[PDB]
Structures are given as structure tokens and as C-alpha cells.
Amino acid sequence: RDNIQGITKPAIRRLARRGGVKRISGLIYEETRGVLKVFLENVIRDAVTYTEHAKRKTVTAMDVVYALKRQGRTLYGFGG
Amino acid sequence: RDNIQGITKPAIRRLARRGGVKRISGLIYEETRGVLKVFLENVIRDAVTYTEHAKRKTVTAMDVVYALKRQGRTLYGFG
């Protein structure tokens, strides 16, 4: 159940490289994992609330889109 | 019409002191004046648009409140 370690150090390094980072400290990975967990917790909580209001057991992509729009992170290309 | 200089250096210093700033460089005042001018330009443009839509020649407090709320800067105390 320790799936937060599934976001490996090379993946975080790749994400930093896409962001234009040349050198990465060794303690960056834990901070990135914590930030990702917090963001995912917020978005997934909103999506699960939307799903529960609809009396559904399956979380759809449209619920995730609504959650992201609620946080102010409108996402294009998934759903509509 | 040079009224941006009406926001004097002591006023900017006071605003920084309220923000917890201890030491201020000499070139900060011009940057603060520019930032204030940009912010006021945006807010006043939105308020004047709201006023023109209402067919009025007077800018009211409600127009400014709506202009600020449109920018995610909700202001409490004027309606």
C-alpha cells in the first residue's frame, strides 16, 4: 500500500527536466512526492464527492474535469 | 498630468513597513509606482466598462466592487 514510492526518482527527474531544471538536490524527491499526494488528495476528494452526489460507483473523467475546474485548473481534451 | 508621483516615497515606505519590510532599496519606489499604475489601470478599465454598460456618467462603488470581484479580489465593506 506504499504506492507513493511508485513515483520513482527517475520520473521526478524527467518531470524536472521538462521544467528546465539542470541540477536536482537529493531531498527534492520527497517534497515532490508530498506535493503530488496533496494535490491528488484534493482533486480525488472533489471527484469522489461529485460521484457520490450522482449515486454512482464509478469515477468518470467528467468528475475529474469538474474537480479540476473547481480548483481553477480547467483541463482540455478529456470529456468536454 | 504627472500624478503617479503623488504616491510619495514615504507612502511606499509605510506600505512596505505594514508588510514587514525592514530595509528598502532606492529603486523600489519606481517599480511600486508602475505596479500600482498597472493594477489601477486594470481595475478602472473594468469599472468604466461596467459604468458604460449601465448608461451612466458616474462611477459608483458597486462598479469598482464588481471589477475587483471579476479579478478574484473580492472586497468587503462597500456593498
Binding site: - | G6, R23, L27, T60, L75
Partner: protein, 98 residues
């Protein structure tokens, strides 16, 4: 010839202005600036006093928050002096100039 240290009066002002609720900008110059700026959008404009007061309050709050962020940026760079690059970095990260 009692002269305070170059940091004592600054801290005294910080403590004084963080405990008050007044407006730190003179009202008449700000009103003149607001009218001059509004002259660029519509000629022959009239302003309610409450409108100018609301604009002043919003501007002062925005500047205070920006200066707090700028102080954080300056402290990050191992400094106590507030510099324009700190303001620019804060505005970029906030999303204004970005």
C-alpha cells in the same frame, strides 16, 4: 545627540503600522491619480467618494501583500534589503507578469 541604530526605528515603524487600520496613502493625490488614469478610457467621468475609497483600499491591500511576498523572496536570497528583482520574481510566481 541621541541617535538610534539604523534598524531600531524601522522595527518601531513595522510594529506601529502593523497594529493600525488607517490608509497609508494621502487621499487627494490618489484621487487625482485615479481620475488621470480614468481619463484614458472615458472623458468627462464623475466618481463617487466610495468608489475612490474602495479603489484605495484594494490598492493598499494588494501592495501590502506584494511587499510581504517580496520580503519572502529577499529573505530567500539571504538578504534583508528589498530589491526590484524580488518584486519581479514575486509577480511572476503569483502569475501576474507570467
Amino acid at each position: 545627540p541621541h541617535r538610534y541604530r539604523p534598524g531600531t526605528v524601522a522595527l518601531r515603524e513595522i510594529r506601529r503600522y502593523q497594529k493600525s487600520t488607517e490608509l497609508l496613502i494621502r487621499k487627494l493625490p490618489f484621487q487625482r491619480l485615479v481620475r488621470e488614469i480614468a481619463q484614458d478610457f472615458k472623458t468627462d467621468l464623475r466618481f463617487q467618494s466610495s468608489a475612490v475609497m474602495a479603489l484605495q483600499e484594494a490598492s493598499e491591500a494588494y501592495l501590502v501583500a506584494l511587499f510581504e511576498d517580496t520580503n519572502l523572496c529577499a529573505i530567500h536570497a539571504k538578504r534583508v534589503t528589498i530589491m526590484p528583482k524580488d518584486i519581479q520574481l514575486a509577480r511572476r510566481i503569483r502569475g501576474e507578469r507570467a
